[PDB]
Write a protein that binds this ligand. Sequence first.
Ligand SMILES: CCCCCCCCCCCCO[C@@H]1O[C@H](CO)[C@@H](O[C@H]2O[C@H](CO)[C@@H](O)[C@H](O)[C@H]2O)[C@H](O)[C@H]1O
Ligand SMILES: CCCCCCCCCCCCO[C@@H]1O[C@H](CO)[C@@H](O[C@H]2O[C@H](CO)[C@@H](O)[C@H](O)[C@H]2O)[C@H](O)[C@H]1O
Lengths: 154, 459, 168, 177, 606, 126, 36
Amino acid sequence: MTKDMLPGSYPRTPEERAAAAKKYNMRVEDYEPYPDDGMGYGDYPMLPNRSQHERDPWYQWDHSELRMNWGEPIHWDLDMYIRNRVDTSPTPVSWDVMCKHLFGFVAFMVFMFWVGHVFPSYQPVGPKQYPYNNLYLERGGDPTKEPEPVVHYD
Amino acid sequence: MLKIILPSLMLLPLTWLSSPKKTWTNVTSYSFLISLTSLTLLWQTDENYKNFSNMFSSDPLSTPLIILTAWLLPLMLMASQNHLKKDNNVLQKLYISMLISLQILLIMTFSATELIMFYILFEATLIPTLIIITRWGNQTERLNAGIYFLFYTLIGSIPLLIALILIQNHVGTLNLMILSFTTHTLDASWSNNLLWLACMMAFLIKMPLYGVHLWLPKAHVEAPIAGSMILAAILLKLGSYGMIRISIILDPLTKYMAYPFILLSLWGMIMTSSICLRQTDLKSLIAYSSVSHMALVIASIMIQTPWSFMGATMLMIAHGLTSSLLFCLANSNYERIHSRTMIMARGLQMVFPLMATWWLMASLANLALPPSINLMGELFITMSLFSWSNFTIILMGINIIITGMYSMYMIITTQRGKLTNHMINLQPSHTRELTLMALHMIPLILLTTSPKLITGLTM
Amino acid sequence: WDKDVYPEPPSRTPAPSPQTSLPNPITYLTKAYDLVVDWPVTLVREFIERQHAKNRTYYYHRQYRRVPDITECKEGDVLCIYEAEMQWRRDFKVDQEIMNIIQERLKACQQREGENYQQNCAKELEQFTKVTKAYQDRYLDLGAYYSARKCLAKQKQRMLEERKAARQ
Amino acid sequence: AFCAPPAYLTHQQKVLRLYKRALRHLESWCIHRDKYRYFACLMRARFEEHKNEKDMMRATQLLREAEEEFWQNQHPQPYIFPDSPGGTSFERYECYKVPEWCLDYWHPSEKAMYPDYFSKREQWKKLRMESWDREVKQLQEETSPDGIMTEALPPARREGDLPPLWWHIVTRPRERP
Amino acid sequence: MNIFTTSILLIFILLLSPILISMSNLIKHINFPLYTTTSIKFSFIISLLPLLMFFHNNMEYMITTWHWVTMNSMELKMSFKTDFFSILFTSVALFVTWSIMQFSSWYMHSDPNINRFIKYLTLFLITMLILTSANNMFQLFIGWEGVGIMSFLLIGWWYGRTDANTAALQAILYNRIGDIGFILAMVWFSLNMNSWELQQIMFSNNNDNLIPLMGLLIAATGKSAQFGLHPWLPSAMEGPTPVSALLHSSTMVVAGIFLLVRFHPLTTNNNFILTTMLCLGALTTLFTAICALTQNDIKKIIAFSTSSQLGLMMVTLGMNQPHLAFLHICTHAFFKAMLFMCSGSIIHSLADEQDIRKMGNITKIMPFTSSCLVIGSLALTGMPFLTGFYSKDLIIEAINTCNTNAWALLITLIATSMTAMYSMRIIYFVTMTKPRFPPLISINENDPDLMNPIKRLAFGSIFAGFVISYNIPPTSIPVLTMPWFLKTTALIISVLGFLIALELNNLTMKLSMNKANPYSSFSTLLGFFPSIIHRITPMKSLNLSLKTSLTLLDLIWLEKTIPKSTSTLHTNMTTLTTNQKGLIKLYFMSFLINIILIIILYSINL
Amino acid sequence: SKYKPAPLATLPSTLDPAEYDVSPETRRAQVERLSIRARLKREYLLQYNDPKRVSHIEDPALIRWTYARSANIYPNFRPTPKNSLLGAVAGFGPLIFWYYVFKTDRDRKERLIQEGKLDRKFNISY
Amino acid sequence: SGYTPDEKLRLQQLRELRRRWLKDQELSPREPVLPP
Ligand SMILES: CCCCCCCCCCCCO[C@@H]1O[C@H](CO)[C@@H](O[C@H]2O[C@H](CO)[C@@H](O)[C@H](O)[C@H]2O)[C@H](O)[C@H]1O
Ligand SMILES: CCCCCCCCCCCCO[C@@H]1O[C@H](CO)[C@@H](O[C@H]2O[C@H](CO)[C@@H](O)[C@H](O)[C@H]2O)[C@H](O)[C@H]1O
């Protein structure tokens, strides 16, 4: 491929813009270059930031699972937006409400867990009583030393 | 060692005196037999390391690398047999001579006893590799890639020369045994710190540290398959081996002179592993995977615990084999579709079912599948670094996640998915390619059976 | 199996003490296993052992005479330092194997005792602790480039510390 | 899948699509068949209540209101036909839809196992070879003089000629191989 | 003892036999699925013997087969730990895999590569058995990670489905985030105890064991799909139904609970860990039961039921009840596998339909499958004396009568009732209402390869619970004294949930429109955890990787700073020096300046 | 309406106000877009169904995309205040952070080890 | 709505060819000629 067909630098004049559009097979009015922030985008067209999930599913795309036709301008972030990764598809519920609901549920759960920790639930019973000095020998205790006599009664 | 060097040299007369028809077969066969001969260096039934003469020696650290080098040459010839299909006989023989010379020099380097052996035989590798990249490469930027590869290493190396000369003036010799057995403590003077850097920087560049790793993504996506294989199987390990051999004198400065490079390694590992996620060139993705693994190796070597050294050596060998296999696989698909993009070719499991199996196994070695020696190495390096500071587990875990992620991303993107049915040229896998992948995998499986061979000096 | 180096308490299996009219499947399965499997396998093994009795050969555990330690080496005398260093390496790994044997004892004790391990394995836990303290004081914090000289320096640092403590 | 989308849609197409989508979502909401019929009849009543509106601005406003209501009331998890996009087993058999160009690489010993099928295939390849020239000329001659183009392709006009660009339409793998 | 160890090893040898036969030309000539089914049957029969030995003398064995390597005072031996857990679970797993491997032949007769499918299922079985019968933490890791790979390969068996590919990678994500904690546990138990063997690790009871047990808890969360890392399991049903039945319910997903049970001795003291597990189990149970309701897929409902059951096991472990938690594992394996098989039968007989809205009147048309499904549901909601009751009831008893987080207890009880509610959802919308399937009925379950496996699992679900519960040795003292309401709490809540579900479902036939509801949407969309996390985290991470790493730094700033700056400077200097006008007058003027400079240097330096 | 778009949950097409436009300018726009798409598809289909093809079909869009994401970057890069700061921080700052973390941790560890507070109970392999 | 005459003709022609190809796909009674 030659220079005219490979990308180039930021379109600085309307004739450059038209030449770039013809290069990218995009309409002269639809073609918009990335902002000239000097981050390497240069001439590449700025395409809509919609994932390939949104593309028509019933259409016989040239590149199928990619869901892009031959010669179509390719988004700068196609790898991120492929069907196997980020999905910008519309949702039945607004993102803001979804965030509120999920985080509110989490907050309620953790708050009530703290409530339970502070106020536990237990049966009305005394602590279990074990024999032989709380099993001093077989619970890992030295034979030489004598533990404090811990007694039990009726 | 001279029962292994001389046959390697004699390969060259065979290459040039063989008839045009039988040259490939003869050199491949005799190279396999040289590889067999190289196994004699595993008869170390005692703790006394082997010293075959005043010039050549071997160790637990050098024997596995030498055997790997011997093993690679036949596979390099098989991998190169194809893209050199329609070149003139002298040009083909030139390529074969370059590979043979590379093997000779690398074996001598790994088996060298004096660091000014090592400094000459280490840089002599630049010429054959530079020729391989620049002459037989495909795309136009191979010249730029060659320039980067040459000069990064030369800028690194010259200070190494200065430091080595100073070392010899101060000590009286450069035989590594003598240095080991008469070493003495350095003092924290600024001049000593500058030395430490001068000794360590050339090897760190060859083990591309995060900030000086720009010459791998270029050299690899501009180099032919054999160049990539030898490069990121042996050349990259030259840096680690040099660091291991030379750090003995440079103590105790390391305790605080390692913080910068440990940090750079432990951060660049994450950065590069992440870069692998969003890269559209299979060769580049493999190269950056290699950069992350060498980041781990550098961290472990610069902490210097027994676990660090042993795991670093194990991972050195494991990465050698695995990255080599990955590059052969990618070149397999490249020889057909004549493109390096990962997105372009997809669903190839529907037409190369067995090569898909080899792809899967390679991806597992990359992602570190237990009990594979790849994992063993990464696990032991992780244990070492966790001992060094218990917070490194955060970085290690993030890198583990991302490693698994790009490793499976390669497979899903390429092998799986709808077959790009427009590709008419996809041809059934060549027995050559399949045998190449088998010869890469089988040694890995056998070493996973017998890890004791590939441990370092420490363990 | 040298019972000394690999201690193994005695077996204390109890009586059959059956109290059921039903037949225990295990005894009959074991009888069938014995007769069917153990007997032919034992025949094969006996044949191999006779074949070994024929053509018997011997191998001897190597003995390494002691040589001067690094303490007896004049600075920079590589000739003697090499021998001292190799001796130290062999002692190092023999100590490694000592640690392996004692750890195996500890593991076998835990498994044998079961839920009494919290008391009946105290002896082997004590032995393990003492040997690991010895191992730590001998080889720990030595770099990957561990050497007799580093070990000597570490020991002398600790001895200086102990002498200071005794003085104070 | 067998027809290219238009440049746009008219009020008729948009409203019909909305009718279908809303009816299917209403069904997804109303599991039982009788309840579904009860509410679908009311839905048709609503849709036809404004059937004849000749002020297209009000028609479009009504359609916008209907669409917003639909988005408010859409079933979170609708009904998806198994093979329909987004339904289980949407592409479950794409692994085995291996193309026909692979057969060209079969070893002659493998082709021996199937003698007749490959003879018929050879006939087919001959037919395609013959028809390519004529069909390319047909498309070139039928190209519209103006610069206005549509994806839809032409039929076979002459006699004894295959329809333009037919190899990919025909020969596509069977749905369940 | 010879017989016991020999049988233990022979089980693995038998399981490897199908694999080796697969890697040979005899695979073409033999009926591989039947061969593998037979091998699994024989392996189960062999396993029965060690189970009997353990039930008799309760002797546990450490068997060291091969010495893989010695690492300076840390041997790595291929060890096996045969005990209550390992032996009983090997028996159960082999039984369930026998049933599912016979049923796979029916469910996958048409599919090509059936041999590869069977090989993969077998491989998974070997790997999971390695996990269970493992002494070394390293070997346990071999199992932990190999089952993960097999799950990846089986999910998205139909690699055509982009959705299934995403599901497999989802599983790898969540599992690896889990395995980070496992590797942390390994490294800590290596540094502080210098051994990966469980016997040696046991002596760490007197340390803190917080840093390692946190790694274990995280790994268990990831693998068993507890709330934090839960999305992977429900959406792991993109795979074939036999895979869902076996791996992602009966055998694999119990890996986290099994690991915690194995490390029960260390976690007895660390109350922080135990309370954390209590809370996590409660939260998962409630969350995934909420999602289980209002879900219209037959397989996803059962998947969420499985997640809820695993949350219950997490609570079981949160209170010091490891034996009972493992008992629940084994007991639920049966009827969960049976429910999955019944659902697979329904899905296959109908035109691969999985929506419970297009299934109805199944009880009349498929008597056998509906009967076994009813048994499975009644086991899931433990009705008295079925397999579930001989575990779940005791679990709830201990929960209600042990000191516990009050909130955790409450949500756990609510989720127990809600399990009845969604089981009723299935039993109703799939077996009680008038038909809804497409008109062309073509329903055949008379295939023995389907009938017999389900028969075996139903006999399991009906008896194994009682048999195991009565035969297992004493372990934990149970609390049997309690008020009447506590004693029958599980039954009353379950029955009340059933009645409430019946009322709600019967309310649907009312000729009135159900409206979109906030709670209905929250339940159906799975709490929005997928929609939010899976759209924010991947985007942010991937965007950072492309922009901050690859572009801003690697492709731009590093090149400018190191190579290109040097290149520039040197070009600037060459263009500064070389370009000389070429006139002798100027050249000799410069020579004059050299003259003067040398004179000055000489003078000043003297 | 009641829906509020978010960058990762786009505005549905039906709710989109512009989808309902019927201005002749908009329709002319859409027709021209379809014309471009049809021309491209015809060009692709000729090569797809050509019987005399012997190789795959190269993708100019893919080539341009890869070139733009690879070799066009540095040539079309210009230092700016924002770029300099972002690069400097995103590079060095994380290294400084991890430096402080590891240094403080290891210094505390060395302090404790020196005093003897830390107990290395069974660290044998380090 | 409804097919154009050109579309109807094209679909009919492709229908004929598609069904001929599908019938071509049938295997003859001897087709799996297993070698000895
Ligand atoms: C710490 C020490 C180690 C670091 C050492 C770094 C030294 C590296 C030196 C690399 C020098 C390579 O020199 C390389 O020359 C080529 C000529 O083809 C330049 O190539 C480029 O030049 C300019 C951009 O400035 C363009 O107009 C031109 O089209 C393009 O090819 C590269 O931009 C430059 O990098
Ligand atoms: C400490 C000493 C270290 C020395 C090691 C590094 C060696 C440095 C090599 C310097 C020479 C590199 O040579 C490099 O050539 C290229 C073109 O080839 C120049 O790049 C040039 O590209 C084109 C013309 O070709 C112009 O549009 C551009 O403006 C110009 O700069 C680089 O600016 C120069 O740097």
